[PDB]
Amino acid sequence: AMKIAFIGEAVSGFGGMETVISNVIHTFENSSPKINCEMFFFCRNDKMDKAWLKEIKYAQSFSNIKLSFLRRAKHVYNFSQWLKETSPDIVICIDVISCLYANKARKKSGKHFTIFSWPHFSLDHKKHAECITYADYHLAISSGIKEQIMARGISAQDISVVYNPVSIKTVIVPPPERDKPAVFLYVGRLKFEGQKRVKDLFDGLARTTGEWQLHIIGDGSDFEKCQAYSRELGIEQRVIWYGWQSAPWQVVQQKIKNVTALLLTSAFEGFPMTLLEAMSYGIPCISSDCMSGPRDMIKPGLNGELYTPGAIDDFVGHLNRVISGEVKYQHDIIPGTIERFYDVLYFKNFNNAIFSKL
Ligand SMILES: O=c1ccn([C@@H]2O[C@H](COP(=O)(O)OP(=O)(O)O)[C@@H](O)[C@H]2O)c(=O)[nH]1
Numbered sequence: 001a002m003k004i005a006f007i008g009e010a011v012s013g014f015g016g017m018e019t020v021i022s023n024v025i026h027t028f029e030n031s032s033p034k035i036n037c038e039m040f041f042f043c044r045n046d047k048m049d050k051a052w053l054k055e056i057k058y059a060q061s062f063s064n065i066k067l068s069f070l071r072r073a074k075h076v077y078n079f080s081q082w083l084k085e086t087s088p089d090i091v092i093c094i095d096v097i098s099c100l101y102a103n104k105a106r107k108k109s110g111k112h113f114t115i116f117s118w119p120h121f122s123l124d125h126k127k128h129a130e131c132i133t134y135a136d137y138h139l140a141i142s143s144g145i146k147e148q149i150m151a152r153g154i155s156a157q158d159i160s161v162v163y164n165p166v167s168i169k170t171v172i173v174p175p176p177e178r179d180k181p182a183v184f185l186y187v188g189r190l191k192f193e194g195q196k197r198v199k200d201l202f203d204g205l206a207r208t209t210g211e212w213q214l215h216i217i218g219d220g221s222d223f224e225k226c227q228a229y230s231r232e233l234g235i236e237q238r239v240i241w242y243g244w245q246s247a248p249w250q251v252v253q254q255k256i257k258n259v260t261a262l263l264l265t266s267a268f269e270g271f272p273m274t275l276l277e278a279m280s281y282g283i284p285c286i287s288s289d290c291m292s293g294p295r296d297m298i299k300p301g302l303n304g305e306l307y308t309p310g311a312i313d314d315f316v317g318h319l320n321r322v323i324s325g326e327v328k329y330q331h332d333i334i335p336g337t338i339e340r341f342y343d344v345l346y347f348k349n350f351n352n353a354i355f356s357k358l
Contacts, residue, residue: 004028004354005086005113007040007079007102008094010060013049016273017120020164021094022052027347040082042075042101076104083109090354092116092139096123096131103134114358118162121270122291123148137357139350141271144292160353163296164271165346166338172282172331176258181211181238182323185262185283187248187274190220198226200265200288204315206233210323214263215256219244249281259283261304261322261329265315266290272297279303279338284329286318303329303337 006025011018025037039058041048046062061078065071079101091106091113093099102115117135119126122144132138132152138159140146146159176183184205192199205214216239223241230236245251252259262278264287272293275285279297285304287294298304305327307314321327339345 002032002035002089003087004035004037005040005088005091006037006094007091007098008042009097010041010043010045010048013052016164016271017094018052020120022056023165023343024347024350025056027343031351038086038088040079042079042098044071072101076101076108079105080108083111083113087111088113090114090116090358092118092354093135094118094120095128096126097128099133099135100128100131116354116357117149119145122268123152124291125268125270137353139353142292143296158357160349160356161296162350162353163341163346164273164276165343166273166276166280166341168342169280169282169335171253172335173252173257173259174282174331175260180258181213182260183256183258184212184214184319185217185252185256185259185278186214186264187217187262187278188264190216190218190222190226192222192225192229195267195269196220197265197267197288198222199229200312200315201263202226202229202233202235204263204265204312204319205238206235207312207316208319208323210320212238212260212319212323214239215242215252215259216240217242217245217248217251249277252281261286264288264294267309269293276338276341279334282331282334284322284331284334286315286322288315297338297341299337301327303334 006021028037039056041060043060043062044064059082061075063071063074065074083105091102093102096119099117115135116137116139117132118139123129132149138149140159140161141164146161149159190198230239242251261284264272266288268290275297278285285298287298287306288309289295289306290309295306298306300306305318
């Protein structure tokens with residue numbers, strides 16, 4: 001009988017991370033005839049939506065002490081007490097600060113367990129990166145995160161790259177018929193610059209040679225700026241806006257039907273699930289080679305392309321070649337190119353990364 005604690009600061013209760021965590025917990029609580037999972041949250045308030053925890057046993061440390069030294073002390077004490085009630089074999093920290101908490105509460109509680117980091121954002125784009133050193137071993141969702149962890153003096157031997165899961169699909173979205181315009185897809189929150197750089201998307205497409213259309217599924221405060229920019233660039237007649245969609249891939253299947261490539265032009269990403277989703281439907285992806293995720297998914301010339309951050313010329317080149325057919329991606333084999341990301345194999349590799357360190 002083995003018990004796994006998943007711990008972190010309170011989250012919103014909606015987000016890719018929550019979805020991954022709940023699925024990994026439900027999967028564990030079946031695995032070996034249910035080996036048990038619980039959660040512990042460090043909270044300043046009870047504003048976390050609880051829906052995603054419906055079937056998940058969780059406890060909380062509440063402290064809104066304004067001085068962080070005292071709040072952390074209180075957190076560590078509360079977690080220490082929980083550890084004594086619960087006696088987990090393994091503690092997995094979904095953020096970096098919780099590695100510190102887990103480490104200090106292990107010393108305080110006198111309990112024996114292994115601490116794993118499992119961060120869901122680039123260490124260099126979030127607050128408490130140096131707290132990663134308090135975990136025993138590391139579960140990297142990307143090569144970039146592994147690199148970031150190594151940079152803090154952690155041995156590559158103590159870090160397993162586990163990626164993130166996606167569901168196997170039984171439908172392929174085919175390319176457009178020959179002599180139809182290229183069809184580009186953008187799926188995500190709209191930011192003109194900042195993280196998403198829709199500006200870069202528009203600048204590239206405006207410079208491309210050949211017939212193309214762009215389908216944009218998403219919304220954000222920069223909608224009007226982005227529409228204005230498309231008008232400025234003289235491309236508005238080739239852009240179709242869907243706004244926010246609850247079922248983007250249903251819209252793709254039912255309304256768009258044929259896709260040349262999904263495009264992502266981001267300055268950075270926590271984990272670009274959109275790329276994975278696209279490749280699960282056999283859609284090739286042209287992405288900025290940003291921290292982090294795209295380089296672990298995209299195999300240049302096989303399921304899409306990578307361009308160096310800011311290399312808009314390179315992006316344009318990638319576009320031109322897929323529009324002309326100079327480079328062709330085979331939609332029928334693209335789903336097989338992300339084998340290690342599919343739910344069952346992902347979980348197998350994740351499970352082995354944990355139990356191999358014991
Ligand atoms: O109109 C949309 C646009 C995006 N997404 C989903 O949002 C996720 C990532 O989008 P985003 O760029 O917002 O990343 P985040 O900021 O949420 O990390 C993906 O799983 C998409 O399928 C969606 O459901 N509807």
